[PDB]
């Protein structure tokens, strides 16, 4: 609904990034179940579990059918291949859904969605107010507004809940980024084209060690190296937020910059949880606060009462 | 329709969980009919239905074509493989559709949908009522409302039907969870990569026992271990409900907390099935009851009659 | 359109059942054209068209290529396999479309859709009628309603057509259920995994008899055993209907239960085809008849005329 | 748009039939390009281009690779297979699109869509007319209607164009049905499972004659035998139309059955092309003519003029 | 938007033809990337790059594996096959998109879309005009219309731009048709089933010449022969247009046929680019001009001024 | 929303081009993951890593199975094939998304979307203004408009931000085009059908060098040669823009061409960032400026004040 203004500039970049993070999780995923087979050949000559080396030349005959090649692929794809290479597309999906759903969980929990639901309502109407024109430079209906916003100020003034949740979201969408890099940089070298496996199934095929190949290992390094670069730019967004979300100390509002402009001084600072909801709407666009900066002044209420 | 308020906080978490439970039933299902073949090799040397064990090495030749390998796969996939491994994706779909449809069956049965249909109607209007402003702090049209809600109170006051059905839903969406864990934890070890089969078809192939492999056995342990963890968190939701749905004993309402605020005392407790429909809307958000806490007071009716 | 009230409780269960009956006809169908191949091996040793029986063991060599195996599969899938196993998904689709379309054919035939089209119209307005409030406890516009419903009573009072068609639908949606069970229970044992075929093509392959396998035979027994259980529960719905649709003998209406409540006695029973359209709307919810139980009373017409 | 009334009962059945005719053309078509391969084996022993006939038995070795089998399939699928078996799904699509598009071409040609566009307009308003209530039993605005329909009668009264086109549609949607049966019954026996081909490519494979198999030949007989039965029932619809479209001889209208009911006699028969547009709307439902049977009577115009 | 009237009868046929032209470009295209492989066999005996010719018979053994057959297919499909056979589905798509997009480019270029945007606006209102009723047989608001259309006549009267573009479209959608036939008839014989190739890769396979087969060559002759017949019927549409678009010489309008009917003579011919926009709307349906044939007459303006 | 007028003619062509650029990135991409295999044969005779050259002829036998051919394909597709041939479809997608998203980023950044959001609003209303009719040839409500646009002129008059961003977009959507041609023309010759590889895996297969083939190399030259031609035509669009975006020097507006027409001279030039938003709407269509050319004249304000 009408929550576009409620999202600052930095949380607009993030909503697009958290999609393209998902696009390379379904594209890498459909490409990993349809395919991501392994090819595997035995090594006749071997030295310590390593394929050492060996008129016109001719092929080598291992005397193996197709099902023995297809059996050893599954073994050397299940056992001697890192779980990160096989599950990378399913894993970035699980994480980006968290990074995404955490943002919107603050809009679904009814203890907090209700407070947002009517706060943006009274600001959206106050923006369109003929009296704000005169103050910036059948009134009894407009008096009920003054009593509404006076009630809605005294209704939400007991404690912080949305400033608690929205502070949790940027506390937990930074730890994840700090957790992602802990494992996604430490396990990307595990994926690689050339794979050697040794699985002890001599009884079936006749060989010990099998050199193998993972053809999509190169295409997953690209997505992974494109993913984590699509997550530090994400992480740089949320870092400046907490730099901005604690330096300001916005437990209350500061109307001191407009009280000179209106020259009324009958408008006091709002105590808690009415500032913060207002503080980011001014960070979105600074007009919507100065038109709401008049409904709290009793002189303006008096001039409206006339 | 306008039933969002009618769903408490715990039944909001559940509607999302009952989707992702389904997403891993269609994804595991398309991946089980397209594929989930079995590979199978015979074991030349065997000791009690068990593949015991056995210059440069060379392959083993079983002298089998492709159709004999493709025939024994079907046999050892039909007979010597547990039904739970093959039907897991179809089974969680059947169950999550029950877990899902049971929630909404209370909205379709016309004996009960009708009662919900107009109860939320009179609350949605009473929320938007100018007279509630004065009481919280051409009236003949508003008098018809007082007679409507007095009639609608005496119309629904005979017995409990929605409190019967909505009590059935959380009685039967707990037994299922208790039934799921009885079988889904006891049969997940049945699925496994390495499979040995012995099916007595020597007349066709020439061998008795065949070692086999199920490559998706690892991918189904993950979904199953992800599913049941996506069902105890579900089950923890419905457990607190019955803790909450019996401790309160909400056969009637308790207006005693607002009768001090209004200071009217002309508003009596509603007898049965008008409280419970109101009791969870107050559990959703506690405003919608205090604005409906005035239309029952005859002094307020008298002041409205003026 | 506004026909939801026009459908009793039992025909609400049925509309969902007639979908899931279709879901296992398209899922079983896409799975039967994409696949449902047969595997087939010859039997070197045979006794009366039956594969009798026969250091380390070795494979048996039939000296057949892939195209001879692929040719004999088509033969033993076309000739020695029951049509019910191959066409089950296409057959339940054909039947559920009949079971489904018969329900809605009563809404498309213009001789009967027209009568339904305005009957529900005059009831939907009469439900919202201020005069019904006073009777339950610029009138000239409401007089035209009294003349409309008096005309619409004398307009539809000649014979039964919707009571004829809606009686046909539950006469023909019971015979089908009785026809389904006659063949679907008598032919489900025909589908089975192990198949033996004998097709007399020695000239091409060299063998007489071929043991075969149908890997989806187990997955079709499940859908079939799930289907017919999804059709007797359907059939139990329509059985109670005719128990209810003949015991009542609703050729006319019985207003005798409300004539005490209104205490007017100026409202006579409606003769034919105006009761039945009204009789099931009262079976849906019993309010919509008692508000329509006043527009037929000439005293109420007189009090409205004042 | 509002053209539902303009379509009689028989052209309602037809719109559904002309869909399911198409559903078995896309289903038979996707199933014919994805697959509909041919299998082909050579016949070592042959007598006049016919595969005559021929301890434990053993396979026959033709000494052919896979590409020689795959080459001869294309030849014996291109040359020795009837075009009707390969193109049946594309052919019923081409025909059902004609059967379908011909119906709606009468709504697109602007010389005739315009006439339909305002004729249904003046009937749709006249149906909702308070004056029709009194006649069936600020008027100057209603006078303009009388002059509108008098003008719209004299505007469309010169000749027949929609009665020409709609007569063409049922002249050409009967000849096609008569053309379909001429070829679709005479060529269905051409499709059959067992196929023998002889193509003179000894230089490549080494054989003259090849027995073959067409596995979908049985599934196309079913659709074809289901299609033509889905076209004679179609053809039976359009046959009764011309029985009905010529027996009536509806070059003009006959208001003689209502002139007794109104007892005005100031309403004359409409000459041409205003009757036929009205004649089928009465065949849809007979109410819409008797309410339009008053706007042409000058006494009614006079009583409206008062 | 409301541009349906703005399209004559001939440009209505064309919009459907330019779809079915596209339907056989995506159907022929999906069928050409999924498949359209080539089969290729070597010719042991050859005379001048031509496969000349050559108890019970036996197969010929070329001693080739599957990858040598799969390598020579790509070569003889890339080199010795005409580009028209491989790219026909992609080529008719490119052309039909031009034939299609050129029609609608006249609606997107803002220099001309603006002129169309308000011309149809003033005609759509003037069609619904009570004063046209009297002339065909609070007026100050209608005076502004007379001044609007007098202004909109003097606003668009300087030169021809839409008559320039719409003349370009039928100049360039005839040259293409004349270009299509120049190449599509001269290259359809290139596609054919039997293909002989000779590619000089003896070093890999061992043979010089390879007979091949293109199984879809017959299905592309049908679409091509169906396509070009679906483009001359298109081309016959645009030919009559220029016969009609130059014979008339519609640089201005001719109101001489209605000036007798109105008998006013105060309505002069519109100079340029107001006639042509009006000339084709009369060619669509001749009513919309005679109702617009009154707003230009100063006597009608005078009678409206009264 | 209502931003169609805000986009000049050249940025309308571009929005379509930036789609078809994407259509050949998803079509080339689905065709590159589904397929784009490589075929590879060894060369028995070789001279310096080059396959030199070599009764009836017979095939060459390399004594290789299918898995050795399938292993060497992956190697010679991963190592000896240019990254541009494999990643071309993924690369044009990444670039066209930038070319596309950069255009619309100027509409999402809230510091600039807000300014556009109300500028087009006041022009869209002023276009529909009765007073503009008189000037081109309850007014207190129209006075508020004059004060609104006087305020909205003094509100946006401090600096340039949208003229900064929209200047950045055409500075960065020209450098990319200049960067595309730097690499896309220099790397298209890398893709080619015939490929020779040499990868040093003698230990597994037995050969050193393998001739290979890339069958889609011809289909990617076409898309690439079609792509870059679909990007210079794009690049020609943005080049004329900067020719037009600097020659005009539109830091302010020039009302001198209309001040003769109105003959008021009370309308001064707008200083900065109100001209440019207006300058391109006049470049779209020159009407919307002359109707907005009156609300700034105090004589017109005075005549409106009367
Ligand atoms: C005698 C060995 C050399 C010839 C081949 C070689 C040895 C094994 C393969 C090549 C040809 C072939 C083709 C086959 O079918 C291909 C299915 C692939 C698909 O489904 O795409 C099968 Cl089964 C077999 Cl046994 C065989 C052979 O005897």
Numbering used by the authors:
A (entry chain E), B (entry chain F), C (entry chain A), D (entry chain B), E (entry chain C), F (entry chain D): 15 to 68, 92 to 174, 236 to 404
Paper's wording?
The underlying channels, termed volume-regulated anion channels (VRACs) have variable selectivity and conductance between cells, but are similarly activated by osmotic stimuli and blocked by small molecule anionic inhibitors including DCPIB (4-[(2-Butyl-6,7-dichloro-2-cyclopentyl-2,3-dihydro-1-oxo-1H-inden-5-yl)oxy]butanoic acid). LRRC8A forms a 565 kDa, homohexameric channel with each monomer consisting of (from extracellular to intracellular side) an extracellular cap, four transmembrane spanning helices TM1-4, a linker region, and a LRR domain. Here, we report structures of the homohexameric LRRC8A channel embedded in lipid nanodiscs in the presence and absence of the inhibitor DCPIB determined by cryo-electron microscopy. The N-terminal arginine residue of this helix (R103) projects in towards the conduction axis to form the highly electropositive selectivity filter of the anion-selective channel.
The differences can be approximated as a rigid body displacement of the lower portion of the channel about hinges approximately half way through each transmembrane helix. This generates displacements of ~2–4 Å in the cytoplasmic ends of the transmembrane helices, the linkers, and at the cytoplasmic connection between the linkers and LRRs. As a consequence of these conformational changes, the channel cavity is markedly larger in the expanded state: it dilates approximately 4 Å including at the first resolved N-terminal residue (Pro15). The conformational changes we observe show how expansion of cytoplasmic ionic-strength sensing regions can be coupled to expansion of N-terminal gating regions and the channel pore. Still, it is tempting to speculate based on structural considerations that the expanded state represents an intermediate on the path to a fully conductive channel. Still, we cannot determine whether these changes are sufficient to fully open the channel since the N-terminal 14 amino acids that project into the channel cavity are unresolved.
